[PDB]
Tab-separated table of C-alpha atoms in Angstrom:
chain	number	residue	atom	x	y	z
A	1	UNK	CA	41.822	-37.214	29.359
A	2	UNK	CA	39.939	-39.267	31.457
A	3	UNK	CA	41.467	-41.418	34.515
A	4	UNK	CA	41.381	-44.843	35.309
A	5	UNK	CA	41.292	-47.003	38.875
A	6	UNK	CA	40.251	-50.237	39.838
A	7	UNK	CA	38.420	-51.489	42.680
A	8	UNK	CA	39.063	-54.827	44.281
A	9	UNK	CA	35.949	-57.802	43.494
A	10	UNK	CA	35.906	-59.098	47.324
A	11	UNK	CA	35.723	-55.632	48.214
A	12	UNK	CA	32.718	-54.071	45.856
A	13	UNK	CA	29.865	-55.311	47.881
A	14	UNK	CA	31.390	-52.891	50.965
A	15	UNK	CA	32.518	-49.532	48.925
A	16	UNK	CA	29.238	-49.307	46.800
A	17	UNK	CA	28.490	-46.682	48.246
A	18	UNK	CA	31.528	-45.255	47.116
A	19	UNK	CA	31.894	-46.193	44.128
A	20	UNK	CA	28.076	-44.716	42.763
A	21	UNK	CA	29.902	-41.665	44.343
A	22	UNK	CA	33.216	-41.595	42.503
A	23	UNK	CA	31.435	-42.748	39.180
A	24	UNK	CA	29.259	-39.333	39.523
A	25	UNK	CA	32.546	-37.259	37.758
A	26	UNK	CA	31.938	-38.113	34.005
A	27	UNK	CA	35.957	-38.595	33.157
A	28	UNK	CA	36.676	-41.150	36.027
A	29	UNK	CA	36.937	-45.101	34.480
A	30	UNK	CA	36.700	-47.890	36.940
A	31	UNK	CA	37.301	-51.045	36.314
A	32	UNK	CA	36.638	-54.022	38.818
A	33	UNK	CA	39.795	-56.905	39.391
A	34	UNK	CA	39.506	-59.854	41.304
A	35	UNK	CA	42.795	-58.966	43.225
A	36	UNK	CA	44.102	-61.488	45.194
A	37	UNK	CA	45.280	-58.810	47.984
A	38	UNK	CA	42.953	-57.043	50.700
A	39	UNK	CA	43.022	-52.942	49.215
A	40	UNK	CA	39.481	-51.627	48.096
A	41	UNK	CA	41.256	-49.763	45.148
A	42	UNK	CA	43.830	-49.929	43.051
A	43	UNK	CA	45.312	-46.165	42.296
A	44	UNK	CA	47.818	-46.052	39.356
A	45	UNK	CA	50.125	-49.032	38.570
A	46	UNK	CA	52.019	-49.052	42.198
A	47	UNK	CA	49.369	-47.405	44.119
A	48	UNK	CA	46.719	-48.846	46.739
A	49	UNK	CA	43.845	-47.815	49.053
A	50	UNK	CA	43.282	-50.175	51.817
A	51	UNK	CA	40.423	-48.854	54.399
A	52	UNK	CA	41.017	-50.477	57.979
A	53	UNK	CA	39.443	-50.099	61.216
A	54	UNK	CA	41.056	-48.675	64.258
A	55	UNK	CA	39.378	-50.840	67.209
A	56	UNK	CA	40.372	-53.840	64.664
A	57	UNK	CA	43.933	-53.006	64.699
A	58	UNK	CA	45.172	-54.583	68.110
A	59	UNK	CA	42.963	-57.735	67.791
A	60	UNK	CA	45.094	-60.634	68.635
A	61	UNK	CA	45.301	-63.287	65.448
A	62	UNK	CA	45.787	-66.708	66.229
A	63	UNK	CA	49.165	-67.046	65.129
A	64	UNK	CA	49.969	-63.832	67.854
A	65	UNK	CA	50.188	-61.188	64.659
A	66	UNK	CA	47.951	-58.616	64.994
A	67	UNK	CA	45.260	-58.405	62.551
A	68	UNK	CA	46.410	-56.505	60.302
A	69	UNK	CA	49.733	-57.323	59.485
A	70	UNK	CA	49.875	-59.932	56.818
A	71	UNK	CA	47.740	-57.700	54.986
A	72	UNK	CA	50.019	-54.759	55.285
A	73	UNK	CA	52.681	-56.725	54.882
A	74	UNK	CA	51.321	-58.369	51.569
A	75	UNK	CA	50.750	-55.308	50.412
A	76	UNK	CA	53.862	-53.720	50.720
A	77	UNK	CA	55.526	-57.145	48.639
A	78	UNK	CA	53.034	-56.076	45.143
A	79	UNK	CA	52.450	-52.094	45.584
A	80	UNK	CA	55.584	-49.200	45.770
A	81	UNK	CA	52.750	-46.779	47.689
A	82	UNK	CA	50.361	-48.232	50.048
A	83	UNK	CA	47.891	-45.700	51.244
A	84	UNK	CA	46.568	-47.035	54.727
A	85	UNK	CA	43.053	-45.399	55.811
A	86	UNK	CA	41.940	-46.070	59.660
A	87	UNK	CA	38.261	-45.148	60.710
A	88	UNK	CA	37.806	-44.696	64.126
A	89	UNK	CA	35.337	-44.143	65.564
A	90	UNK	CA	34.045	-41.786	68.665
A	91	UNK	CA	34.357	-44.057	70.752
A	92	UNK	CA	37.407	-45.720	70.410
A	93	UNK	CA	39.265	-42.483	70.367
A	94	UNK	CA	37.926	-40.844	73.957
A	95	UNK	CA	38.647	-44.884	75.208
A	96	UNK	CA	42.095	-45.151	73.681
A	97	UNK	CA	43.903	-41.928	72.867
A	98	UNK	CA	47.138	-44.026	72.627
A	99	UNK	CA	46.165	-46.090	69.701
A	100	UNK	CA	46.271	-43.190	67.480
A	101	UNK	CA	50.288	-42.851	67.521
A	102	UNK	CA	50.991	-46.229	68.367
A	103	UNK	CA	49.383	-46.880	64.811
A	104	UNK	CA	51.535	-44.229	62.952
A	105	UNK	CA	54.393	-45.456	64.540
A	106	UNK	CA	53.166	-49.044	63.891
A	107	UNK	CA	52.602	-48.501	60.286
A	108	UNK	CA	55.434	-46.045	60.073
A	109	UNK	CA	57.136	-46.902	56.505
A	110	UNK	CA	58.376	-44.438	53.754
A	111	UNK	CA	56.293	-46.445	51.544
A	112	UNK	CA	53.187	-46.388	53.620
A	113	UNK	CA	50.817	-43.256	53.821
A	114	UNK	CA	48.539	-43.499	56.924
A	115	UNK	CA	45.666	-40.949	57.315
A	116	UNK	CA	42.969	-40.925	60.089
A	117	UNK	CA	38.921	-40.624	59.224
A	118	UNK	CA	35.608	-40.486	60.887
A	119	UNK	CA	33.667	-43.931	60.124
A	120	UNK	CA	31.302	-42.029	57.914
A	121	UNK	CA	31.645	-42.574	54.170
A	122	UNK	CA	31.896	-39.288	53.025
A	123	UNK	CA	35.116	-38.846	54.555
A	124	UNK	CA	36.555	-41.969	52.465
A	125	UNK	CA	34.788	-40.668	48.818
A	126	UNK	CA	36.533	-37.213	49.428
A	127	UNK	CA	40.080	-38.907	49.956
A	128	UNK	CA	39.905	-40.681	47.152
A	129	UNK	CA	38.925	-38.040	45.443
A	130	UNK	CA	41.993	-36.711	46.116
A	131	UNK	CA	43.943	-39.659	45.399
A	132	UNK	CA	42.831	-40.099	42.040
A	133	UNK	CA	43.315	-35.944	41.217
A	134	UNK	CA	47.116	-36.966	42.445
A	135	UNK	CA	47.642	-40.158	41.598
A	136	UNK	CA	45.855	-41.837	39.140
A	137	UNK	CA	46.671	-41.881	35.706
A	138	UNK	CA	45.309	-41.244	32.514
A	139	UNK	CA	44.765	-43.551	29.361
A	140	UNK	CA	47.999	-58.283	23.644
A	141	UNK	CA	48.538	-61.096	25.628
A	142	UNK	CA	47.356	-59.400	29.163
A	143	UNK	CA	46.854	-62.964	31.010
A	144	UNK	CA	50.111	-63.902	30.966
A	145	UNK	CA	51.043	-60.916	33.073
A	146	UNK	CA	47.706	-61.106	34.766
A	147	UNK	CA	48.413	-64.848	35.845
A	148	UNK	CA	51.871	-63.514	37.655
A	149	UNK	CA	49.782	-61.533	40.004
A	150	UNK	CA	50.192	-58.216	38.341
A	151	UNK	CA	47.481	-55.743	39.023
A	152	UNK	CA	45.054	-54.611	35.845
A	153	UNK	CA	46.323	-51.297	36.149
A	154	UNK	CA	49.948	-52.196	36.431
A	155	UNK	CA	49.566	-54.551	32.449
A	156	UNK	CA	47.528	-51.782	31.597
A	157	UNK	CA	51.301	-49.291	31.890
A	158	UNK	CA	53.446	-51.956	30.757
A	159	UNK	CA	51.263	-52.197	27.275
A	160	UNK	CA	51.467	-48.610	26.941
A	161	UNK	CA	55.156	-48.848	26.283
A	162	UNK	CA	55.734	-52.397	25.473
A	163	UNK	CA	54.341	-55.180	24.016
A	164	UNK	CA	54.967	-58.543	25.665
A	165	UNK	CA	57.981	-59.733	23.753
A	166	UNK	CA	59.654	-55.656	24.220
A	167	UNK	CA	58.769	-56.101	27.576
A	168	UNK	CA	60.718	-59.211	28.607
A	169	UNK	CA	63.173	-57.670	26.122
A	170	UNK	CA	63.532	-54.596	28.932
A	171	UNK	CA	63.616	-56.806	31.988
A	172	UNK	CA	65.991	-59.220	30.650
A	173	UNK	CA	67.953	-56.020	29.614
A	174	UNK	CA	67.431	-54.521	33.068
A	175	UNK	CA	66.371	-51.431	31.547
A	176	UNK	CA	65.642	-49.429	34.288
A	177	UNK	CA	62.431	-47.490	33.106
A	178	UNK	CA	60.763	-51.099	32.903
A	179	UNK	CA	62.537	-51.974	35.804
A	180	UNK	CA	61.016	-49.407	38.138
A	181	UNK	CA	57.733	-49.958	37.339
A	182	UNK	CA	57.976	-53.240	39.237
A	183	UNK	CA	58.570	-53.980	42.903
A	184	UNK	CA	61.609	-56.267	44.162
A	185	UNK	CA	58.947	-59.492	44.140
A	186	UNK	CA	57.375	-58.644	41.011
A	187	UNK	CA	61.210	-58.519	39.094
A	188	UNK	CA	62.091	-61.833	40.701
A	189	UNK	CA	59.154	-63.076	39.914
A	190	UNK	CA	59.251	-62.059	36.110
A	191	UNK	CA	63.357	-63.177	35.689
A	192	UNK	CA	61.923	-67.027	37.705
A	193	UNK	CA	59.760	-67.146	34.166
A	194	UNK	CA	62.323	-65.670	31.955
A	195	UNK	CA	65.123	-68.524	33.804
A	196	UNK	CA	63.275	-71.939	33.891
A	197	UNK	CA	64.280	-73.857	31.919
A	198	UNK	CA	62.495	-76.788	29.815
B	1	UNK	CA	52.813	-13.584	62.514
B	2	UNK	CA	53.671	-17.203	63.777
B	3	UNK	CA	51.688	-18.918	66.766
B	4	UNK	CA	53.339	-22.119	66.931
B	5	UNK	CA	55.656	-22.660	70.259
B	6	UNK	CA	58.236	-25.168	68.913
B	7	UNK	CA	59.166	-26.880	72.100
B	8	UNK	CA	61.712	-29.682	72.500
B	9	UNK	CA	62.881	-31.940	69.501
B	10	UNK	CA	63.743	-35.177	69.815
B	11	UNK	CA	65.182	-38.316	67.282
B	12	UNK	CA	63.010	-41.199	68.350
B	13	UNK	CA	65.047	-44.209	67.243
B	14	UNK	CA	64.387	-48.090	66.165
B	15	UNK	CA	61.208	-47.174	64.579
B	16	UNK	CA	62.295	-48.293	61.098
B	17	UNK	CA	65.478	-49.205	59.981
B	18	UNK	CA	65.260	-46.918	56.989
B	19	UNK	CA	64.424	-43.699	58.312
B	20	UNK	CA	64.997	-41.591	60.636
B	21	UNK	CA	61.968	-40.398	62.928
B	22	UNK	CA	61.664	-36.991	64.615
B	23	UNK	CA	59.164	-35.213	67.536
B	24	UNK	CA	58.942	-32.251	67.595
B	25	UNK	CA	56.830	-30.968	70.911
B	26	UNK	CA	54.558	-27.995	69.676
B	27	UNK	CA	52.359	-25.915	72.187
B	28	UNK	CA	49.306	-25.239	70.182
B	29	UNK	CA	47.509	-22.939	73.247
B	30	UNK	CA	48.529	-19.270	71.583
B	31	UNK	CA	46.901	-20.807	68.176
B	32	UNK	CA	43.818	-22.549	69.596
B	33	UNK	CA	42.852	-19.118	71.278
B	34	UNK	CA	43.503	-17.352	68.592
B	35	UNK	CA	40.985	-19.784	66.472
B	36	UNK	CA	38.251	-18.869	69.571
B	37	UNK	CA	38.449	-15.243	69.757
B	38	UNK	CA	40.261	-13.891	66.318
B	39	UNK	CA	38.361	-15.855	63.606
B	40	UNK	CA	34.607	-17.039	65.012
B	41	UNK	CA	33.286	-17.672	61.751
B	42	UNK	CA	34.415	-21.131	59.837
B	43	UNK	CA	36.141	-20.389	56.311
B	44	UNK	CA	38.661	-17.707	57.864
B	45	UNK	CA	39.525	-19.773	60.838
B	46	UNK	CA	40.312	-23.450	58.240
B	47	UNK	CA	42.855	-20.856	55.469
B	48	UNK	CA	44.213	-19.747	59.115
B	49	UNK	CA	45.233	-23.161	60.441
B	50	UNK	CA	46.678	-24.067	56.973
B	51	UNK	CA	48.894	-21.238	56.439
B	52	UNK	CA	50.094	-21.410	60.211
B	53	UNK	CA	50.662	-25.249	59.403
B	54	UNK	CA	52.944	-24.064	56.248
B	55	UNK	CA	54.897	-22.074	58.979
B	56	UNK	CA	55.026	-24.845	61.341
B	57	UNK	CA	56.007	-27.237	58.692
B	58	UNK	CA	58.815	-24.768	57.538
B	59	UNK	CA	60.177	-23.601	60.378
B	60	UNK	CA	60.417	-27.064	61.749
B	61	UNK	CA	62.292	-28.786	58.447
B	62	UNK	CA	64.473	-26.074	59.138
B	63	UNK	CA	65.614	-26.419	62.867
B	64	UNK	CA	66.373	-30.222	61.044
B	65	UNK	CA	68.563	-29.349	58.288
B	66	UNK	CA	71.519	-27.287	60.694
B	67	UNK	CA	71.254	-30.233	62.765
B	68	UNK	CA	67.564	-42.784	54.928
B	69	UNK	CA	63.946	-40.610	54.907
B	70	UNK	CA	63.174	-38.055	57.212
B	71	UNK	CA	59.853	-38.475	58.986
B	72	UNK	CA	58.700	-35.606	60.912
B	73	UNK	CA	55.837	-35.990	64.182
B	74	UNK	CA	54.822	-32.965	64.766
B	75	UNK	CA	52.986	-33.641	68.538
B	76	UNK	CA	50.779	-31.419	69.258
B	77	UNK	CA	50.099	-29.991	72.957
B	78	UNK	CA	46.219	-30.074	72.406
B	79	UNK	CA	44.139	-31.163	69.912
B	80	UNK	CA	40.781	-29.567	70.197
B	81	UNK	CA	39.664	-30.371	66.547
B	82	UNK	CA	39.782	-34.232	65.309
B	83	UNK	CA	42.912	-35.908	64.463
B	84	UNK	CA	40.830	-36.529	61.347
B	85	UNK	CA	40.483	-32.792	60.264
B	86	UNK	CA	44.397	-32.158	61.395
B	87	UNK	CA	45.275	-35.106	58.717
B	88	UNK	CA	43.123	-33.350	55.983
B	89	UNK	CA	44.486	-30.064	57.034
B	90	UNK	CA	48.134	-31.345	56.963
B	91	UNK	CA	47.865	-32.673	53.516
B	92	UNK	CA	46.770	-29.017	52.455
B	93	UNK	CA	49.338	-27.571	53.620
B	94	UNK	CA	51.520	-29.320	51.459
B	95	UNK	CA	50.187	-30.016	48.455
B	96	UNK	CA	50.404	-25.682	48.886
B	97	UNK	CA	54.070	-25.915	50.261
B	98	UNK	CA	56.178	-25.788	47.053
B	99	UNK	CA	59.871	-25.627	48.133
B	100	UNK	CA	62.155	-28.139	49.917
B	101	UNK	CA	60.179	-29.285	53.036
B	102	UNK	CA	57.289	-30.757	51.147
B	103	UNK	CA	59.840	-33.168	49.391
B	104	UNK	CA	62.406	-33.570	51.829
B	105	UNK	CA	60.455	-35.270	54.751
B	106	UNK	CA	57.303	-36.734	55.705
B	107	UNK	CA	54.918	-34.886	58.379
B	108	UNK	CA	52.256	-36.824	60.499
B	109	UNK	CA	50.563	-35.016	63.384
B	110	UNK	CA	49.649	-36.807	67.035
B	111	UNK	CA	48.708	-35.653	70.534
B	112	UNK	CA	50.860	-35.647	73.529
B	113	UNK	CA	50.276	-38.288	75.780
B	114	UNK	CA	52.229	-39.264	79.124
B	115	UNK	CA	52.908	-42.474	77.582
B	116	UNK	CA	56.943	-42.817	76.629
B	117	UNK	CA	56.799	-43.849	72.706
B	118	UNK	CA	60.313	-44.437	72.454
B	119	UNK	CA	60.030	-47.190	75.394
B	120	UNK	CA	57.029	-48.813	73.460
B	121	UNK	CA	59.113	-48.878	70.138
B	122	UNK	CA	61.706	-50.585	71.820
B	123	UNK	CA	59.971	-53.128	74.411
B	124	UNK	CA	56.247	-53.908	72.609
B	125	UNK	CA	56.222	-57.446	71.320
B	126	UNK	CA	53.822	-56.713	68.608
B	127	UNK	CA	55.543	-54.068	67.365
B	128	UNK	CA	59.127	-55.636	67.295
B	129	UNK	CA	57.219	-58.799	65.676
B	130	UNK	CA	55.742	-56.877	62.869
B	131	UNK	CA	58.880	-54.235	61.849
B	132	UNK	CA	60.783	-57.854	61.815
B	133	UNK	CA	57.709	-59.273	59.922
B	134	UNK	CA	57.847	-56.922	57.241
B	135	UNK	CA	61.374	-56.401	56.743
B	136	UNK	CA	61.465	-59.758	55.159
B	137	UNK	CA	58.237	-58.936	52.940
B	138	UNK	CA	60.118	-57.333	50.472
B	139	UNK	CA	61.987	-60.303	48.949
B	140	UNK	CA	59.042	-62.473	49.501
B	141	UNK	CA	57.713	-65.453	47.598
B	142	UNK	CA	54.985	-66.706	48.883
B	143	UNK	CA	53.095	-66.117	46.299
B	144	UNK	CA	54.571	-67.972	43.978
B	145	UNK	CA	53.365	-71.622	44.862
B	146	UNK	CA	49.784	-70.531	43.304
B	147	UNK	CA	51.457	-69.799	40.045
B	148	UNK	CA	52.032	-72.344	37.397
B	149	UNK	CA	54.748	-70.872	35.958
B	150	UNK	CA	55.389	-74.116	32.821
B	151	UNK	CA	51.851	-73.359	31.595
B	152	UNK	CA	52.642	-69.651	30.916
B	153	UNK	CA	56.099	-70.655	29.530
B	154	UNK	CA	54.516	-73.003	27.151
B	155	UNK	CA	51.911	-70.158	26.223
B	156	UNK	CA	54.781	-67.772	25.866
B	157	UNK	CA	56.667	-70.201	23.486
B	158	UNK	CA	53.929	-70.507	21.217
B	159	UNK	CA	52.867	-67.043	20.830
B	160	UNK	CA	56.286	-66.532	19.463
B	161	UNK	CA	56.534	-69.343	17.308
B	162	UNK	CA	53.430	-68.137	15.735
B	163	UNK	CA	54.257	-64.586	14.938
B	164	UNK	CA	57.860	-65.391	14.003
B	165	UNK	CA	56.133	-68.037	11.779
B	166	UNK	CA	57.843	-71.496	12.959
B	167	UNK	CA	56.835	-74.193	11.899
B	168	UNK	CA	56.613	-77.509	13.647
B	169	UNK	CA	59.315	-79.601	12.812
B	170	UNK	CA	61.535	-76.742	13.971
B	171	UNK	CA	60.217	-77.242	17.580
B	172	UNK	CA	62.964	-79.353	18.921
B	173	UNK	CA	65.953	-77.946	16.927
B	174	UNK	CA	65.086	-74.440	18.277
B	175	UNK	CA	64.551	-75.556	22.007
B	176	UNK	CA	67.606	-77.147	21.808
B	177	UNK	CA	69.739	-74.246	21.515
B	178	UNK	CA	67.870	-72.297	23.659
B	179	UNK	CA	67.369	-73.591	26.932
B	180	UNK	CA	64.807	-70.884	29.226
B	181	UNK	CA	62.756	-67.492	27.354
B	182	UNK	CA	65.783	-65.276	27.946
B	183	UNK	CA	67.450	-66.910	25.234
B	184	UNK	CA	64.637	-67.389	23.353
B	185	UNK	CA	63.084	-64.244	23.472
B	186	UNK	CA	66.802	-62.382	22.635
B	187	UNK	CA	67.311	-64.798	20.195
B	188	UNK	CA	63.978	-63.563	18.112
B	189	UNK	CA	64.690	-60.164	18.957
């Protein structure tokens, strides 16, 4: 029984620190994806971690989003959980004590988890060492499913049950158990390949 | 023994379309002394705060049941610990809480502030920009232009030729009756 996560490639050189941490426990496998999306980890196979900053959060883009929204917002298109972690600092919190609701309210989103820590690291290794006692699970042509932007730990569930032919078999089928394993983009994306024709 | 003073309750609305969001004002000044006088030394005073919090968290689910997805602010008075030990502290309490207010709503703890949050909700530009930004994010395809989608089709098509054991010549008969990998992939199944 040992349990598996990934970490995001653009995102190693920042949680190294971390991840010598979480690499300590003997039964935790981590795997490193270059994910196209902005989370440091990848949880189970609908599950992220995606550290922001809370001084960060109201700095105007120049398209007049806010900074992070598109990354949020992409986030919420691939993975059915997003876990949202703002460090704030000292500082910013006896400046602006508004910012703290106006982000949970902001980011308020039954599919979003938002939890506030202090800007030292420790405080991110022991929530995600609590995310991965919940969450994280325990365990071929992978590029095709890799190449349609699925995560390594999401191919890694779908071969568990499937193999690639079963697996189209299930979608085309709408068989629900393969079904909800995917997001609304990630099914339309899989019935677009399944309905081109040649 | 229960030190929470539930206060007013109130359905803040237009926050998201799919749930519904409720404050709930709690004075926290009959706890806080109690944390300052009752329990000086650390490890009594943390098990107190998280078994009051599976009180609060109770007795507040239940004042909402007599009266989408149910999210729950319970706005604290005064915060004299971090927000950041109240969020570890709140996710103790119910990973503890076995019953139906764990599962039947979603808890996040703020502060009071004299700032009106249901008149930011409704008049912020940012805010109204972004809950319209994102309720078209979940029927997006933007990601799709980066995928060639023909090159794993072809790929697809000749990973099953080969373990079904086609051989060439039977190429053009057998995309001919089958037009996209739906049918072909039903077909060989």
């Amino acid at each position: 029984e040992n349990k598996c996560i990934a970490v995001n490639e653009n995102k190693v050189i920042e949680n190294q620190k971390v991840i010598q941490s979480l690499c300590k426990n003997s039964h935790l496998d981590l795997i490193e994806q270059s994910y196209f999306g902005e989370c440091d980890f990848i949880i189970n196979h609908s599950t992220c971690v995606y550290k922001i900053q809370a001084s960060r959060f109201m700095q105007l883009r120049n398209n007049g989003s806010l900074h992070y929204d598109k990354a949020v917002n992409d986030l919420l298109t691939e993975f059915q959980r997003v876990i949202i972690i703002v460090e704030f600092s000292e500082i910013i919190q006896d400046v602006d004590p508004d910012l703290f609701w106006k982000i949970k309210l902001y980011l308020l989103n039954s599919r979003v988890d938002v939890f506030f820590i202090h800007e030292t690291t420790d405080f991110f290794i022991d929530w995600m060492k609590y995310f991965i006692a919940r969450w994280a699970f325990s365990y071929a042509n992978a590029d095709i499913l890799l190449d349609l932007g699925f995560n390594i730990l999401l191919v890694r569930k779908i071969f568990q049950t499937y193999s690639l032919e079963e697996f189209f078999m299930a979608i085309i089928k709408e068989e629900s158990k393969a079904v909800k394993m995917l997001t609304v983009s990630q099914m339309t994306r899989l019935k677009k390949l399944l309905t081109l024709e040649w | 023994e229960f030190f929470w003073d539930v206060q007013k309750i109130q359905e803040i609305s237009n926050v998201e379309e799919h749930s519904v969001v409720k404050c709930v004002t709690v004075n926290t000044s009959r706890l806080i002394s109690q944390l300052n006088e009752e329990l000086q030394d650390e490890e009594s005073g943390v098990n107190f705060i998280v078994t009051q919090l599976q009180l609060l968290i109770n007795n507040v689910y239940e004042k909402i049941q007599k009266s989408r997805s149910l999210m729950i602010n319970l706005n604290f008075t005064r915060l004299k610990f971090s927000i950041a030990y109240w969020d570890i502290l709140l996710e103790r309490s119910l990973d503890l809480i076995n019953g139906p207010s764990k599962t039947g709503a979603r808890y996040f703890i703020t502060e009071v502030t004299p700032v009106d949050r249901s008149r930011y909700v409704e008049n912020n530009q940012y805010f109204l920009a972004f809950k319209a930004n994102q309720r078209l994010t979940r029927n997006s395809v933007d990601m799709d232009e980066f995928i060639d989608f023909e090159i794993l089709i072809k790929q697809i098509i000749f990973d099953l030729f080969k373990k079904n054991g086609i051989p060439d010549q039977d190429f053009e008969a057998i995309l001919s009756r089958f037009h996209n990998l739906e049918s072909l992939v039903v077909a060989f199944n």
